[PDB]
Design an enzyme around this catalytic site. Structure first.
Site, PDB file in Angstrom:
ATOM      1  N   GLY A  95       7.285   6.183   5.393  1.00  0.00           N
ATOM      2  CA  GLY A  95       6.177   6.682   6.188  1.00  0.00           C
ATOM      3  C   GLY A  95       6.160   8.187   6.350  1.00  0.00           C
ATOM      4  N   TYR A  96       7.344   8.780   6.428  1.00  0.00           N
ATOM      5  CA  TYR A  96       7.494  10.221   6.593  1.00  0.00           C
ATOM      6  C   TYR A  96       7.554  10.952   5.252  1.00  0.00           C
ATOM      7  CZ  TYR A  96       9.820  14.685   7.728  1.00  0.00           C
ATOM      8  OH  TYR A  96      10.144  16.024   7.834  1.00  0.00           O
ATOM      9  N   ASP A 266      20.217  10.100  12.655  1.00  0.00           N
ATOM     10  CA  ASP A 266      20.350  10.352  11.223  1.00  0.00           C
ATOM     11  C   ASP A 266      19.815  11.752  10.974  1.00  0.00           C
ATOM     12  OD1 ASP A 266      17.294   9.347  11.109  1.00  0.00           O
ATOM     13  OD2 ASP A 266      17.748  10.471   9.289  1.00  0.00           O
ATOM     14  N   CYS A 304      40.049  19.358  13.908  1.00  0.00           N
ATOM     15  CA  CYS A 304      39.547  18.311  13.036  1.00  0.00           C
ATOM     16  C   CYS A 304      40.643  17.521  12.320  1.00  0.00           C
ATOM     17  CB  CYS A 304      38.582  18.922  12.019  1.00  0.00           C
ATOM     18  SG  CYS A 304      37.829  17.710  10.960  1.00  0.00           S
ATOM     19  N   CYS A 306      40.082  15.459   9.782  1.00  0.00           N
ATOM     20  CA  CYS A 306      39.663  15.031   8.455  1.00  0.00           C
ATOM     21  C   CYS A 306      40.639  15.434   7.355  1.00  0.00           C
ATOM     22  CB  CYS A 306      38.236  15.533   8.147  1.00  0.00           C
ATOM     23  SG  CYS A 306      38.065  17.158   7.309  1.00  0.00           S
TER      24      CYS A 306
HETATM   25  N1  LIG Z   1      10.167  13.304  13.199  1.00  0.00           N
HETATM   26  C1  LIG Z   1      10.640  12.502  12.493  1.00  0.00           C
HETATM   27  C2  LIG Z   1      11.081  11.577  11.512  1.00  0.00           C
HETATM   28  C3  LIG Z   1      12.157  11.661  10.750  1.00  0.00           C
HETATM   29  N2  LIG Z   1      12.220  10.631   9.960  1.00  0.00           N
HETATM   30  C4  LIG Z   1      11.212   9.831  10.150  1.00  0.00           C
HETATM   31  N3  LIG Z   1      10.868   8.554   9.471  1.00  0.00           N
HETATM   32  C5  LIG Z   1       9.776   7.866   9.802  1.00  0.00           C
HETATM   33  N4  LIG Z   1       9.449   6.763   9.214  1.00  0.00           N
HETATM   34  N5  LIG Z   1       8.936   8.348  10.826  1.00  0.00           N
HETATM   35  C6  LIG Z   1       9.193   9.543  11.516  1.00  0.00           C
HETATM   36  O1  LIG Z   1       8.484   9.973  12.404  1.00  0.00           O
HETATM   37  C7  LIG Z   1      10.417  10.329  11.134  1.00  0.00           C
HETATM   38 ZN   LIG Z   2      37.740  18.716   8.919  1.00  0.00          ZN
END
Ligand SMILES: N#Cc1c[nH]c2nc(N)[nH]c(=O)c12
Ligand SMILES: [Zn+2]
Ligand SMILES: N#Cc1c[nH]c2nc(N)[nH]c(=O)c12
Ligand SMILES: [Zn+2]
Lengths: 369, 369
Positions: A95-96, A266, A304, A306
Site C-alpha cells: 500500500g505504501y 519496523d 554493546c 554484539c
Molecule cells: N507512514 C508510514 C508507513 C510505513 N510503512 C507503511 N506501510 C503501509 N502499508 N502503510 C503505511 O502507512 C506505512
Molecule cells: Zn555492537
C-alpha cells in the site's frame, strides 16, 4: 502454538510488554522487526539476524511481486524456505511502496496499477501475494496519505483505506489455509487529525483484526507531531491486541512510542544507515567514516554485547567503510540491528520491572548528551 | 611451535603433501591461500574464512601501505589484531602490484617510486612494511616480468630480482624480531626460459630462503605454457622447502601444478569470480546469473559440504546476485572458497593414499565434461 495469541504480561502507564505466540514462533513485545527487502535483511545471513535477538522480520509485497515474483516464490516453497528464515515474517501490503517507488501510477477504488524499474495491486491481489509468500502476519492493503494533507484529502484517503480494509479482511478469510495459519492486521490512517483517526480506529475495530497498525506517521512528521498524534491515536485501538507503528524506528522515537502504547516497530534505519557509516551507541549515533576514528581501538559501542563489538575496533570498521568493503557493511549492519534489539530488551525488562519511565529518562539523558 | 618447519609426510611422483609449522599455526600442504586485500577477504568474516578450511591467508604490502598505512596498522597492533585473523598470514611484497595498479611509475635499481589513486618501494621498505604488518611469511621484493618478454629483457629483469632477493634477505635478517618470528620466501623469475629459471633458482638457493616461490607465471601464459615451464622449473628448487606458485588458482591449474611439485597457491578467482556470479562445481563452473537457475532448488554444488550448499538454493542465490544484494556476494564467496579448500583436501588425501594421479584424472574428466 496457536495461530495467534497476544498476551500482556506487564504494564506501566501506557507501555506494555508481553508475547505474541504464532505457529512459527514467539514474538517478544515491544518488538523491532528488521526489514528484509529482496528476500534478505541486507548484508546479513538469517542466522545472524536471529543471533542479534530478532524474533520476526518484515518482508514486502511490492518488491517481491516484482522480483523474483510471488508465484515463483510459492513454487519454490515460500519465502521462509527461499531465504532461510523459519520464524515469523510480517509482510507489508504494498500500500505504501507502490506509491513511493513506482515510476508511473494510476489510483482508483479498485486498487493501484503501476510500472516499475505494468502491474496492478488491489486489496485482493495484495492479500493473495502475501499468501503465496507464506506470510505469518498479513497487512491489510491501505493507502498511506502524504504528509501534510488537507482534512478533505486525508478524509477521502482514510475512507478508501477503510473500504480496502474490509476487502482485505474478506479476501483473507476466504482462503482457508491462510485464515487458519496466518494473522491479519488492519491499518489506521487519518493523517494527524483526531476525528479521522477515531473514525478509522472505529471502522477497523468494527471489522475486527488480530492486530492494529498505526499507519501514515512515518512520512515527514517531526517527532513532536508524531508523538502528539500517538497520544490520542493509540488509545482508540483495542487494548488487548498488538499496536504496530509502521516505519518508525529512531531509538528515541521507539522509546517515546512505547511510552504511548506501541508494541511493534519496523524501519530501515539500522540497516540502511549502517551501510552508510552511521553506528548507533548509547551515547548517540556516530559516523564511523569520520577521521577521528582512524586509530580508535574501542568497539563501536562500549557496552554493546554484539559479536562485532566483541571482536573489531572502530579503526578497522572505519577503514572498511572508507574502502567500500562489503565486510564494512556486514559489520555495521550486524551491530546496528543488535543495538536495536538490545534497546527492545532493555525496554521489555524495564516495563516488566516497573521502571520503564526511569529507563526512558536515563536513556534520553545519555543519548542526547 | 617453531618459527618455521616444513615436513613432507607423503609423496607420489612430483606431488607432495605435508605441513608447515609456524608460531601462529599449522599449514597443511598443498595449500590454497584466500586473498585478503584491504585487510579483508572480501565479503567474509575471518571466522568464515577459517570455517571453509583455510589455514593461512594472503595480505598485500602494496594496498595496505596506501590504505590504511603500514605504520598505522603497526600502531594499532598489527594486521592480525586489526582484521581479526590470528593464524598465519603471508604478505606479498608489492613487487607485482606496484606495476599493475599504480598510476605512474619510475623503476630503478633502488626500487620503484609511484603515485596511487608519490610513494617509494624498495626491497628494504617492502620488508619493513611486512614487518610492521606483522606478517608470518614475508615475500622478497621482486619484479614480475611482463609476458611475453624477450630473452634479453627477461634476463635483465630476473638479474635485478636476484639482486633484490639478496637485499630482501639482509633486510629481513637485520631485524631480530622479524628474523626470529617470521619466515622469508625468495621468488624465482626468468619468464618462460629454462636457462634464466635455472640461474634464478641457483641464485636464490645460494642466498637461502625458508621457501621458494615461482613468480611470473600468472601474467598471461596459457596453461600449456605454464605447465611446460613448471616441468623444468620446480625441480630446480630445493626439494625440502615449500614451492609456492604465485597467483595461480583455477581448479585445474592447481591440480596440474601439484602434479608438478607445487605446495602453495593464491589467487583472487574464488572471491572475485564469486562476486561476479561464477560458482565452482565438480562439474565445472556455472554462472548463477543465468536464467536457467531462476527456479533451480538444488544447491550450488551437489556434493559440496559448505554452509551455503547446506542451506540455500541456486534459485535464491540467482535472485540475490541479479538484485545486486550483498548477501549474494557473501554466499557465492563462501561457497567458492569452501570449494577450493575441499579441492585441496581431496588433493592432500589422495597424495597421502598414493592415488593422486587417479584423482587428477577423475577430476579432469568430470570437471571438463
Ligand atoms: N507512514 C508510514 C508507513 C510505513 N510503512 C507503511 N506501510 C503501509 N502499508 N502503510 C503505511 O502507512 C506505512
Ligand atoms: Zn555492537
Ligand atoms: N605471475 C605472477 C605473480 C603473482 N603474484 C606475484 N607477486 C610477486 N611478488 N611476484 C610475481 O611474479 C607474482
Ligand atoms: Zn558449497
Amino acid at each position: 502454538r496457536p495461530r495467534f495469541s497476544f498476551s500482556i504480561a506487564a504494564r506501566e502507564g501506557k507501555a506494555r510488554t508481553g508475547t505474541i505466540e504464532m505457529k512459527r514462533g514467539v514474538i517478544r513485545t515491544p518488538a523491532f522487526m528488521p526489514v528484509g527487502t529482496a528476500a534478505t535483511v541486507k548484508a546479513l545471513k538469517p542466522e545472524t539476524v536471529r543471533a542479534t535477538g530478532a524474533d520476526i522480520i518484515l518482508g514486502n509485497t511490492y518488491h517481491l511481486m516484482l522480483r523474483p515474483g510471488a508465484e515463483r516464490i510459492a513454487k519454490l516453497g515460500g519465502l521462509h524456505s527461499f531465504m532461510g528464515w523459519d520464524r515469523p515474517i510480517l509482510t507489508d501490503s504494498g500500500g505504501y511502496q507502490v506509491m513511493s517507488l513506482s515510476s508511473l501510477t494510476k489510483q482508483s477504488e479498485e486498487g493501484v496499477t503501476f510500472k516499475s524499474h505494468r502491474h496492478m495491486l488491489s486489496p485482493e491481489r495484495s492479500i493473495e501475494i502475501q499468501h503465496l509468500l507464506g506470510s505469518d502476519i498479513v497487512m491489510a492493503f491501505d493507502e498511506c496519505t502524504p504528509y501534510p494533507a488537507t482534512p478533505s484529502r486525508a478524509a477521502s484517503s482514510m475512507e478508501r483505506s477503510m473500504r480496502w480494509a474490509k476487502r482485505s479482511r474478506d479476501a483473507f478469510d476466504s482462503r482457508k489455509e491462510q485464515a487458519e495459519n496466518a494473522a491479519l492486521f488492519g491499518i489506521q490512517q487519518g493523517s494527524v487529525f483526531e476525528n479521522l483517526r477515531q473514525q478509522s480506529a472505529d471502522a477497523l475495530a468494527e471489522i475486527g483484526f488480530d492486530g492494529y497498525a498505526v499507519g501514515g506517521l512515518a512520512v515527514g512528521e517531526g517527532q513532536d507531531e508524531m508523538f502528539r498524534v500517538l497520544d490520542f491515536s493509540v488509545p482508540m485501538l483495542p487494548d488487548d491486541k498488538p499496536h504496530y507503528l509502521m516505519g518508525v524506528g529512531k531509538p528515541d522515537d521507539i522509546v517515546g512510542a512505547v511510552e504511548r502504547g506501541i508494541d511493534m516497530f519496523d524501519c530501515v534505519l539500522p540497516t540502511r544507515s549502517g551501510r552508510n557509516g552511521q553506528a548507533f551507541t548509547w551515547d548517540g549515533p556516530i559516523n564511523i567514516r569520520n577521521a577521528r576514528f582512524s586509530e580508535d581501538l574501542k568497539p563501536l559501542d562500549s557496552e554493546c554485547h554484539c559479536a562485532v563489538c566483541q571482536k573489531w575496533s572502530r579503526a578497522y570498521i572505519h577503514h572498511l567503510i572508507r574502502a567500500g568493503e562489503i565486510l564494512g557493511a556486514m559489520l555495521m549492519t550486524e551491530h546496528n540491528i543488535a543495538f536495536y534489539q538490545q534497546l527492545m530488551q532493555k525496554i521489555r525488562d524495564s516495563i516488566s520491572e516497573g521502571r520503564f519511565s526511569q529507563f526512558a529518562q536515563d536513556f534520553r539523558a545519555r543519548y542526547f548528551a
